[PDB]
């Protein structure tokens, strides 16, 4: 329990506290992936083999 | 009947006769063929055309 990080030490430096249920952080994440996958370029109905 | 080959002339030279139902010959045949055939390389189920 002692070894875990503590959000209350940062919390006394904030104008709006998390003890007041204001989240300490607001983050925007943008992911860009290039995936080379074992799929056809477009998946169009109809089969090559019967 | 006379013109046919006769196994009995060879047979008197053999330690175990064919008249005793010992075959005169025991042969091992090994065949290696390269066949170029009008078949697909592997025959895998499913058809190209419907």
UniProtKB/Swiss-Prot annotation, chains A, B:
Annotated localization: Virion; Host cytoplasm
Superkingdom classification of source: Viruses
The name this protein goes by in its record: Capsid protein VP1
Portion of the parent chain present: 504 to 553 of 553
Source species taxonomy: Viruses, Monodnaviria, Sangervirae, Phixviricota, Malgrandaviricetes
Protein task: Assembles to form an icosahedral capsid with a T=1 symmetry.
Protein family: Belongs to the microviridae F protein family.
